Amino acid sequence: MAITTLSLPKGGGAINGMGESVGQAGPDGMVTFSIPLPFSAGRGVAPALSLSYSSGAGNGPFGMGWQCSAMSISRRTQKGVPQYNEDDEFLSPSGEVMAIALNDSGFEDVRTANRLQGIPLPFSYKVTRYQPRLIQDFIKIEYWQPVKQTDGTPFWIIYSPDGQTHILGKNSHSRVANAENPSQIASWLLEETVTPTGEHIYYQYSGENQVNCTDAEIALHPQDSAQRYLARIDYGNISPQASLFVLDEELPNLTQWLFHLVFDYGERDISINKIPTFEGGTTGWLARPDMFSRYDFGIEIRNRRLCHQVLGFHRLEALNDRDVTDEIPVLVNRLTLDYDLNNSVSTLVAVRQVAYETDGSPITQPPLEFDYQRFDTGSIPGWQEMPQLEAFNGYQPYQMIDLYGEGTPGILYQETPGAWWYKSPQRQIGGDSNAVTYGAMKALPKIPRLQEGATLMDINGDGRLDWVITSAGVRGFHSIHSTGEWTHFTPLNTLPTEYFHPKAQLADLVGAGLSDLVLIGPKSVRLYANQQGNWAPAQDVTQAENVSLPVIGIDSRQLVAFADMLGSGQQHLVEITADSVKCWPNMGHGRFGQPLTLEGFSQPQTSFNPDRVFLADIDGSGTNDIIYAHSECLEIYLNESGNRFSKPISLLLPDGVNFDNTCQLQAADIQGLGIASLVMTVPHMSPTHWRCDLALNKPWLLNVMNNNRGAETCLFYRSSAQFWLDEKQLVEAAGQQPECHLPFPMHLHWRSEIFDEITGNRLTQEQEYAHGSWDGQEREFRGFGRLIQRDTDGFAQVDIPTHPSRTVSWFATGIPEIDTTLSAEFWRGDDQAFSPFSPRFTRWENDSEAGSDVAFIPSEHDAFWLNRAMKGQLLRSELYGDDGTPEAEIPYSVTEMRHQVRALPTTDATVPSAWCSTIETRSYQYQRVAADPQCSQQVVIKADRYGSPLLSVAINYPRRKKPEKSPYPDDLPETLFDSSYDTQQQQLHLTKQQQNYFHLTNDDNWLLGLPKEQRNDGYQYDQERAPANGFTLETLIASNSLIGSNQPFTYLGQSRVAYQGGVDEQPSLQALVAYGETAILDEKTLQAFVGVLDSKTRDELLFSAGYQLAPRLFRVESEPDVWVARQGYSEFGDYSQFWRPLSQRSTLLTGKTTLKWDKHYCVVIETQDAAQLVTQARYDYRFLTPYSLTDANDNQHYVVLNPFGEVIASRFWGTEAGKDAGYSTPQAKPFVVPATIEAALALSPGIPVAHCAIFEPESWMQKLTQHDVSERMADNGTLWNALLQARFVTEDGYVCALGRRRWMARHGLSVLMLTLLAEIPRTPPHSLTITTDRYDSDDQQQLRQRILFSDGFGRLLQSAQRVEAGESWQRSEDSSLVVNVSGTPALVVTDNRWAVSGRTEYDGKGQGIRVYQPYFLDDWRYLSDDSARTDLFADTHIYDPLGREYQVITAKGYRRERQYTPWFVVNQDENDTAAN
Amino acid sequence: QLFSKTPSVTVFDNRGLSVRDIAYRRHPDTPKVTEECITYHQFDFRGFLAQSLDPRLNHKEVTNFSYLTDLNGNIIYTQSVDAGNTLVLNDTEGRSVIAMTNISRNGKDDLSLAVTRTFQYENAPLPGRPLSVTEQVNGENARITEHFVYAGNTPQEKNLNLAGQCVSYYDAAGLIQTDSVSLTGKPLSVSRKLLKNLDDTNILADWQGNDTSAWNSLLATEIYTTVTRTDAAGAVLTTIDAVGNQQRVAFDIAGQLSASWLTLKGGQEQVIIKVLTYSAAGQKLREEGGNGVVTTYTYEAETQRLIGIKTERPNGHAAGAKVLQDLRYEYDPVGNVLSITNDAPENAYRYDSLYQLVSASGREVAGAGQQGSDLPSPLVPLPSDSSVYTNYTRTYTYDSAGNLMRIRHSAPATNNNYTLNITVSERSNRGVMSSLTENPADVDALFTASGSQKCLQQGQSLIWTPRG
C-alpha cells in the first residue's frame, strides 16, 4: 500500500436511500431501532452519534421513545434522593457504578497535582482516578477537585485505551446542578475532544429560558435554568492543537471551526421553500405542547424544547483556504423532523433529508414515517359480567394478591379460620392465548394468620411476600415462596414502630421498592429508616415553614392520596376537593416543595361527597387519572401531560345498573393487557361483578414505521406475563413444577411481519423465551435463560414450500438456582458431544515476569456479583429448519460458548470489580443428520492484565468410527457411504496463535492495544491420542500436555512491526509505523531452492527477490533466524501538518509516491510518483470531493455532482497523438442536463459531456396539486390545506405514505381519493443513465439511453436500453402486458422499442427464486408482475435455510439436485435427476 | 432414464477440503457395472494439495506429483510425471525473475536442459517496471530477447500519451515502436518493424548492448506500421495496417454492430452487409451479406440452441430464388446434441453418462478413403447427387483416466471398415497410434523432458525452443 492515488468519484451509481436499519431483538426484550446522522466526516474525524427509538425509552427532545443524547457523568437515584454529599454514588454512561481505583499496593489512585498535560495548573489542585464495578474495556478516568473545592468547581477527564480523550464540566453550560446553588452539582457534561492529530470537536449546550413561555409557567416554574439542550456541534479547528483547547483561558471564535451541526426547534422557517440560515434571527425556540418536569435528583427539572430541523454548515471559502472575511457557512444539508403533537405527548410522525439548489430550490429524499400506539378513548367499548368471579367480592367476599411470581394475582378469600382459597387465573381452554378465567381454590398449610398486623406485603423487597407479625410483643414475619414455601418464622432484629394511629402511614417517598412508614402532616416530618426490611433510627425534620402543609384524615367532602398524578413514579402528595386539587413536589429526605395546583376539574360542590371517586392512571403515562361516579354514569378526567385535565368522558353504566355506596369499583388487568381493565361489584343482587372494556394494546409503543420507498414494520408485542402463564400452563400440561424466577410484569415485543412492497410476498419473524428471571435482592430483570427464535418467508405462488426457521438459545441470568435447569433443555439426539462449557473465574497478581492469574473459587457473595455480571452472556444455541421430517428434531447445527471472568480488587470492599470473556466456542455441524457432525473448538489460553489474547488455540476433530449403514437416503450407491472414510479423517489438527503488544501508558499516556509480535505453530495427532471428552485448556496446560512444546510442531509463521519516531521502532505518541515486516523463507521452506541451486545462487536469489535475514520470533531454544522482507515505508509531518501522508511506499524494491496537500491539509490536491507522473485534482468543498483531475499527459477528467453530493455528469478532454481532443472545457460549453426523463427521451447527439444521469425515487408515491384536487372538489385549496395539516399530502404535494390509509380512515374519503390516483401507478424508484458515443468534437454521438429501477431492499430490480424499432411486446396502461385475447404478448411493431433485462422474482433474503427471462418491450414504464408470473419463463432457485439452492428447477421442469452433509456433498443434473 | 443415479459427490476432511473426486459413470450398453470413478486428493498440514492420482496407478503404488513452497506456502518448484519439474520465480513484489522447465527424470536430474528465461527492470527513481527480458540457454549464454523501452514525460510523450510508456518493445521478430497513443489510452500508432530479414531463421531478435544504434542491423526494412483512430466509446473509429489496409465500423443506437467497411490494401472501402437482423439476445437471426443470400438461424430462445439454419438466394435475387441449405439439429436436457440433418442424410451421436462421446454415425463422401495425415481432393464440381456422401458409423473409446483408447468404424456402403488404436504409456499421457509403436512402455521414451514429442508425425524433424 501507499497513500491513495489521486482518484475520481465513482462515475456511476444506483438509486438508494438511508436510515434503513431496524435492529434485531435480544434477551433484554427491549427492542430498539437506530439511524445514523446525515452529516460529514470532516477532514476524517467528526462527531459520530446516532439516533434511536427504543421500546424502553422515555420522553426527550427527540420526543417520546427516542435517543441521540451523547453522555455525562451522573449520580444514582434508584438508591433514592442524593445527599449532595461525599457519600452519594455515581455512574458511568456505560451504566455501571464508579468506584475509586486502587494501585499495585492496593492504595487509592489519588494525589494533589499542579499540572495537566504538563500544563502547570492555575492553582494547586487535587485529583482522584476512578474504577467501575464492571469492565468491558479499560478506559482510564479521573475526577478533579480544587484543593479548596469552593474555588471554582471540580470536573472530569476520560482516557480511552485508544487514547481518545474527553472532558466534563469546566463551564456552567457544560455542567448541571442546582440552579439556585450549583454547589449541588448534578452532573458534568462533555464539552470538547482532541484527536492524537490535534483535531477537535466541541459540543454546545443551551440553557433554559422564558422564550415562548406564559404566565402560568412563569408562576409555577421560576427554576428552569439548569436545563440544557445539545444545540450545536462544531469541528474542524482552524489550526491544529494536540492538546485540548479548553486547557486555555477561553475557546477561540466561532470562525475557528469549519464544520457545524446546528439544531433548531422551529426558529428558522420550517417551510420546505425556505433554506434556513446559520443565524436564526429572533423568532425564538418554541416550547413543546406537553411540557412537564422531573424531580428525581431532588430538584426541579423542567422539560420543554424538541427539535425539528438540523443543519450542516460548511465555511466554504475557508475550506477552500481561499477567503475568510464574512465566510458565513453554507447550510450544506437540512435534516427535517416532524412530530405528532398531543396535550400529553409528542413523538415523530416522520423525518426527511433535504438539500438545496443554488437558486434555493429544495431537493428531497423520501420521508420516513412512524406511528406509535395512540391512546384514544373514542375507542372505549361497553361492559361485561364476570361469571368467573360473579359473587366473590363486596366488602369481605374478596381477597387478592399475586404470590406465585404470577405478574397478576390470585383471588384468595382467607380469614382467621381462613380458607386460604387461592382461586387463581388460569388460561381458558380454546380461543386465543389471551383467554383466561379463575379456576379452583387451593388452601394450604399456613401461618397463625391472626392478631398480628397479618398482611400481604413483601416488605424486604424480596420478590416474596412477607406475611407480617407485629402482635403484642411479637414481631417478625414468615416469608412465602412462589412455591408456597412459608419459610420458618423470621425474627430479624426488626424495629417496628408504635403505629400509634395507623392514620397517615407513609410508604413511598423513602424510595421505590423499599417503602417505609412515617406518621406525618403539618409543620413536621417524621423520618423513615427502612433498608431492605431493616432499619436505622428514625428522625425528625421539617420542610420550610412557608411550604403548604399536606394533612390527613379530614372527611369534609374531600380526598387525599400519596399518588403520582405527575407520573414520575414518585407518588406525590395530592389533596383533592370538589373544586381544587394540589400536589406537593417530592423532596424525598425530610421534605416536599410548595405544591402546585392542577386544573381541569370541578363538581357541584354542594352535591359532592368524598369518594364516589377513583384514582388509577389509565392513560398509561403514570399520571394518575380520575373517575367520579354519577347516578347512571362515570365521569373520567384524564391528566393533561401531568399538568391539567381533559374534558371528562361520560361512561354509561351497564343497563339497569346504578352504582351506589354498596357498589365497589376497581381496576385490574383481566386480559393481560398490561394496563388495568375496568372492574366492579354491585353487592345488591346475588351476582355482582362486571368488567368494562377499554383497549387492546399498551399505548405509545412504536407499532409501525415506514419509508416512502414503501417499507413497513408490523410490530407485534405481547405480555411477558402472558408468556409466563403460557410457559406455566404448557409445562403443567407437562406436569412439571413451575417456578418462573421472573415474578415481575412487563409487556415486551414479540413478533413482526414484513412485506414485499411490490410482489406481495411477506415474512414472519418471532421472538420467544423462557425461564423469566428477576433479582431477588436488587429488583432487576435478570433476563431469560432460554430464547427461541423462528421465522418464515411466504409467497403469492408456485411449488416452493417455505420451511420455518427454528432455533433455541441460552443466556446467563446470573442465578444458579435456575441457570442450572437449562442443562435439561439441550437436545441430545447426538450423544458423544462433550461436557457443558463450565463458567470459571480468576484473579490477576503482579507476579514477576509481569504478572499472572490464579483461577479460583471466590466467595458466594462474589459469585452473586459474578453471575450478575455474566447475566445476558449468550451461552448456547441450536438451530433447525422446520418440516414434517424425522430431522425436524435435529438441528442444522449447535454451539456452546464458554465464558470466563477476572475478578478485581476495589476501593469497594463489598464486591470486587470484574470483567468477563467468552473464552471458548464449540460448534457441531450436523446438516440435521444426527449420526456424525463435523465439529470444531476455539479457545483462548493466555491473556494479560488487560485481557489481550496472548495465546489462543483452535482444534478440528477426527471423524467418528465407521458406521454400519448410511443414514442418508439410498439414492447414493452404497459405494459412496462405504468409501466415505479415509486415513485423512483419522487426524486431529490444532493451531496455536501467540502474540504480545506494547503498552505506552505512563503519566498522561494510556496507549493500549498496540500490535507488536506474533507467531503461530501447529500440531497434528493420531485420533487414538485424545480423551473421549476432548482436551480442555485446563487439560493441555498441564505438565503432561500431549502438545507439550518438546513435541516437534510445525512453525506456521510469525509477524512483527516497526514504529517510526523516537522510540526505537516502538510506538511514538501517535504510534506511526515505520514498516510492516514480511517473512519469506527458512531452512524448512528452502527445499524448492535445494532442488535447483548452489549456495551462491540460493543466497543471490534471496537477495534479488528482495529478502534479508532477521531474527525469528517467539524464539525456541535452538531456533535459527529467518529470511524476511519489510513493507509500508511512509512519512508524515507532525501535528502542525496533522501528520498527513507526505510520501509513501510499498517496498524499497519499488517506487515511492509523493502527495501534496491544501493548506489546511484537508485533501491531497496533487500527487507524483517514482515515474514522476504529476497528477492534478480540484475539489468541491461542499463534499470536499474532486470535480477535476488531470493526468501527466495534461488530460483533464471531470465530474459534477448534485447538491446531495452524488454524481450527475462527467466528461474528459486532453491530447491525442498531440492533437487537442475530447469534450470542451465545461466553462467553454456551459450546458444543461435535461430536468426530466420525459424530456431526456428527446435529447440530441453532441452534448458536451461523456455522461449524465437523471433520477426519480419518490415517484413510488403519486404527486398531486391544489389545482389537481380542486378540479374535483372546487373548494380551490382549503381542502388541500386541511389534507396537508392532516399529513395526507406532503408539502411537495405527494401523497404521504401512511397518509394514504390515515386519511381514508380518519375522514373516510373514498374513490373520491382514488379519482386522483388509481391510473398513476406506484412508480418504482428509477433513473435514466446517458453516455455519449463520441467526444463533442463529433456531433454524431450515439445516445446510450438506459433506464433502471431499484428498491431499498434488494436494490436493483430491472434495467432496459432503448433499441431500434420493430416487433416487441407492449405494456398496458394498467401495467399489464398487452395481450391478444388468448393472452399471447402483443408482439407487434413499436417505434420506441426497449431491450429489457435483469427482471427476476426477487426475494426477502435478497436473491430471487424465479429468474425471469428478458425480452423486448415498447415502454419505459414498469410492467405488472402479475402478468410476469402468468407468462414469463424462469428457473426456480430452491434455496435451503442456509440460502443454498439444494435444488434448481429449469423452467422446463428438469432439475439439478444437491444435498449437503458435514462430511460430503452430493450433486445431480437435469439428465440424472430424470429418475421420474 | 438409465442416466439416473449417476451423481457426482465431493467428500472432505475435517479441515474441509475434498479428499476425493467422485462421479458415478456407466457405459450404457453394459449397464450392470458403474465404475470406481473416484480418485485420491491429498493436502498438506497447510491444507495445500500435495498429491492426487490416476486410480489406475494406485494399486501400482507409484506417485504422480511434487509441489514445493515458501512461507506463505505458494508453489515454487513442482513436477508431474507428464509435466516434468518446472519453475517460474517471482519477486517479493511478484515481478517475474526467471523461468525453467524440461528437466529429466535417479533424482539427480539435469538442469543443463533448463531452457531459461529471465527478467530485468527499472531502477530508482523509476518504479521498477520491466525494461527487458533475456533468454538464457541453460548453463550458457543469455541474450536480450526484448526491451520495453519506457518513455520519459516530454511534451512529446504527453502529446502521444506515451508518458513513461513503452515506446519501444524491441522484441522477438523485431520492434514495435509504440509511437502514438490516445487521451483515451488507446494506442493510435505503432511501427511494427520485423527483422532486418524476418525470413532469416537465425538472426537473433535479441537486443544486446547499448541501444538500437547496434540493432539497426537487425530491424526490418518492412516498416509495416499500424495506425489507429478511436471513438470516445473506445470502439474503433478507423484503423490502418500501414501497408495500406484499413477499417471502419458503425453501430446501432445501443452498441451492437450495424455495419463495417474494410479497405483492402490501398483500395476503396466497402460495406460487408446488405441486410441485418439479430436476436434480442444480440445473437444473429436473419442476415444477408454482400453475398446477397437470405440466411436465417432458428434456436431455442431460452438457450439459443439452434434448431436449424436455412439459406437461399431470395426470390428476386440477382440469381433468383434458390434454396442453398436447410440444416436441423437436436439436443438433450443439459443441451448435448444428439442428431443433425440438412436438405437443399442424417447424423447422430452418443456419449457416456460422463458425456464422454462414444458414437458419431452419419454420412461421409465416397472416395475420400480412410483418413491419413492428408487432405484429399475435393469433389468438383459440387455434387448435386443425392448419395456420394454415403452413410457410415464411427465410434470413440477412452481410458479410465483422461486418455483415449481407439476410434472404431464401419463404412458399410463400401465395406471400407477399419479401427484406429492408440498405444499409450504405462505411466504417463505419452501415447500415439499403435503403428508408430505398439509398445505401451517403449512409447514413453519418445517424448521430451517437457513432454513435447521428440519427433514429428512419423519421426520427422522438429525443434522446440524457449517460450516452449
Curated annotation (Swiss-Prot), chain A:
It is found in: Secreted. Residues 383-692 are annotated as: 5-bladed beta-propeller domain. Disruption phenotype: Cells with a disrupted yenA1-yenA2-chi2-yenB-yenC1-yenC2 locus are no longer pathogenic in C.zealandica larvae. Residues 21-372 are annotated as: SpvB-like domain. GO terms for cellular component: cytoplasm; extracellular region. It comes from the Bacteria. Keywords: Secreted, Virulence. It holds the Pfam family TcdB_toxin_midC. The keyword Secreted applies. Toxin complex is secreted when grown at 25 degrees Celsius or less; at higher temperatures the proteins are present intracellularly but not secreted. InterPro entries: Integrin_alpha_N (IPR028994), Sal_SpvB (IPR003284), TcdB_toxin_mid/C (IPR022044), TcdB_toxin_mid/N (IPR022045). Semipurified toxin complex consists of at least YenA1-YenA2-YenB-YenC1-YenC2-Chi1-Chi2. YenB and the N-terminus of YenC2 form a large hollow shell of beta-strands. The shell is closed at both ends, within which the C-terminus of YenC2 is probably found. The Yen-TC:K9 subcomplex is about 26 nm tall and 22 nm in diameter with 5-fold symmetry and 5 copies of YenA1, YenA2, Chi1 and Chi2; the chitinase subunits may be solvent accessible on the exterior the complex. The Yen-TC:K9 subcomplex has no insecticidal activity. Residues 389-698 form a 5-bladed beta-propeller domain which closes one end of the shell; the other end of the shell is closed by the RHS repeat-associated core domain in YenC2. In the N-terminal section; belongs to the SpvB family. This is Toxin subunit YenB. The gene is yenB.
UniProtKB/Swiss-Prot annotation, chain B:
Its main location: secreted. It comes from Yersinia entomophaga. GO terms for cellular component: extracellular region. It is found in: Secreted. The keyword Lipid biosynthesis does not apply. The gene is yenC2. Semipurified toxin complex consists of at least YenA1-YenA2-YenB-YenC1-YenC2-Chi1-Chi2. YenB and the N-terminus of YenC2 form a large hollow shell of beta-strands. The shell is closed at both ends, within which the C-terminus of YenC2 is probably found. The C-terminal region dissociates from the YenB-YenC2 complex at pH 4.5 but not 7.5. The Yen-TC:K9 subcomplex is about 26 nm tall and 22 nm in diameter with 5-fold symmetry and 5 copies of YenA1, YenA2, Chi1 and Chi2; the chitinase subunits may be solvent accessible on the exterior the complex. Part of an orally active toxin complex (TC) with strong insecticidal effects on larvae of the Coleoptera Costelytra zealandica, Acrossidius tasmania and Adoryphorus couloni and some Lepidoptera larvae. The TC has an endochitinase activity. Belongs to the RHS family. Disruption phenotype: A double yenC1-yenC2 deletion is no longer pathogenic in C.zealandica larvae. The keyword Secreted applies. This is Toxin subunit YenC2.
